[model samples]
Every structure is written in structure tokens, then in C-alpha cells.
Target: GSHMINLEDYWEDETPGPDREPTNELRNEVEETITLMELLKVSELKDICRSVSFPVSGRKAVLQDLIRNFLQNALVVGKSDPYRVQAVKFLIERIRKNEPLPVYKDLWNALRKG
Candidate 1:
């Protein structure tokens, strides 16, 4: 039998340094984009990679990690309307709060329509 697991234990060693905290504003956008990417299907993700000229072949987890690394390397300031960014950020916050988030059949469409 397994004992209980404490998330604090798992996250204890994973904290970022104080100096790593803030770099002005757009960092939030980078994080939000990656969070949104996790909701997309594999085919959609591959299309994103194609659009960005990133390698597209990989399992979903690998693809996610790749996107994360890509974001970490570069600031992603897309041309999405500012209102759409605001809307999606609201949706993401709702998801984080364990509230309902709408799921369009195509996640990309949901995001684009935001």
C-alpha cells in the first residue's frame, strides 16, 4: 500500500530564486500561451510547430515540453487583439480556480474567438 503524498514535499526543491521572479510585463503572456497550448490536440500542436518552424513529431508530453522550452527561450508576443488576450487570461484564471472553462471542439478556435 502507498502512503499519502504531500505536494509541498514535491515542490519544496522546485522553488525559483528571488532574482528569477519578475522581468516586467510580458512574461505573463508567455506563461499564458504555454498554458493554452496544453489544451490543444496533437494535430493542432503540430500545426503550431509547423507555423513556428519547430519540429512537429513527438508525443503530446514531448510536444508540450518543447513548447515550454521554446517559450523559455523567447518572448512570445503574438498579434492577438489585446481584448482577446485579456479574455483568455480570464479563462485561464478560472481554470486555475477550478471553475468551469468552456471547451470548444477546436481549442484553437475557442482561443482565437476569445
Candidate 2:
């Protein structure tokens, strides 16, 4: 039998590139998330912190900064699946559009189930 099969797997998908870095778009999205979070009331911010299981007892500024850090961490180090990524995207849009209270519920449930 021909030996052609032996080398096929080597070149099929073996190319390696430089180490992955956070893309500009994801960085932009994180910044946008932080901005939107800033506009949220403290009550809403607490809801977000509770949703993410972050500390919910902080002052408004503290909660905002913690959420800011969370978004940055997600941008740089999150290993979330595409579904969760899209979930984050959706949540941001919902907030931007002045979505109702149910979105907080949505956010809470989405994070819990995810």
C-alpha cells in the first residue's frame, strides 16, 4: 500500500501561530460593558454582582470597579464557551436598550445555568 496516508495528518491542521492575544473587538466589548455598568443604578449593580457571585456588599464605586475588573478579566482570560460569550453580548445590548427588570432575571438565570 502507498505510504501517502502517513504524512497527511501532519500537514492537515498542524500549523501553529503566535500565542493568542485579546482581540481589539473583545477589548472594545469589555470597555463597553464597563461603561454600561456604570450607568446602572446601584441596585442594578448589586443584582449584577449577585448574578456573578461577586461580593454584593460593596459601595457603589466599589461594585463598579469590581465589575470593571471582571469584564477586563473576561476579556483577557475568560475560557467561556461561545454560548456564554454571546450571552454576555446579549446582556450588554439588553442593558443598552433599557430593557426591563426581567433582563436582570435573565442575567441572574443565565449566569446560574451557565
Candidate 3:
């Protein structure tokens, strides 16, 4: 036997906001959903995360690492090199588009080669 359900009805109340309390279970689900949404929005950002050689503590830690890298690169190479400038530009563009930057594999590879 097959049961038919309406997703729209089920999802109508899924919005997170002032009305939502976000208990631990709900928080975990929301976190996971946000993570997936982030991944889809920016596959490149996922790559940047993968480029990290060390394991990040978790989602927040990974985001912190990405922010640190962006700021560091912006302060250093951003002023001189066009590529660096472009990289940061693209990063910002993705962010503006609500996409994630890739794992920064290119940056890691460049550093290794250089």
C-alpha cells in the first residue's frame, strides 16, 4: 500500500523565525539543512572546505576557517595580484549569490607548487 502526502502542507510550518523555538532536535535538523543548502549554493565553497588539510572542529569551525582565509588573502595578495583579486572577487560574488566557495583546492595546489 502507498500513502500519498502533500509536502507543501507539511513544509508550510517549517519556516524558522520568531514563531519557532528551535529546540535541540529542531536545531540539529536546521543545521543539517543549512549545511546542505550551503553546499548546493556553492559547490566551490565545499571544495574550499575540503582543501583544509586539518579536520575542522565542526560546521562553525569550518566557516571560521573560511572567513579567516578570505580575510588573510584579502589583506596580503589582494592588493598586488590580479588572480588573488579575482579569487576574492569570485568569493564575494558567490557569497552575494548565496553560494559556497569551492574547497580552495586551487589555492592549496598553488601554495604547494610555489
Best by lDDT: 2
Compute each candidate's TM-score over C-alphas: 0.38, 0.48, 0.26
Q: Write the per-residue lDDT of candidate 2 for residues 1-114, one digit (tens) a residue.
A: 246545655447755633256666666766776676667676666555654466777787887665555565664443533333444455456555766435545665676678
What are the clashing pairs of model 2? Answer: none
Model 1, span 13-111: residue lDDT tens: 865634334444457676767677567566555544554445666677776676556555554333223333443444445545655444433544655
Candidate 2: RMSD over Cα atoms? 10.2
Q: Which runs in model 1 stand beyond 4 Å of their true positions?
A: 1-22, 75-114
- Residue 57 alpha-carbon offset, candidate 2, angstroms: 1.7
Sort by lDDT, best first: 2, 1, 3
lDDT of 3 by residue, 19-111 (tens): 223244434533443443344333444433444443444565466455444434433322422233344444545655766445566763564
Cα lDDT listed for each candidate: 0.53, 0.58, 0.45
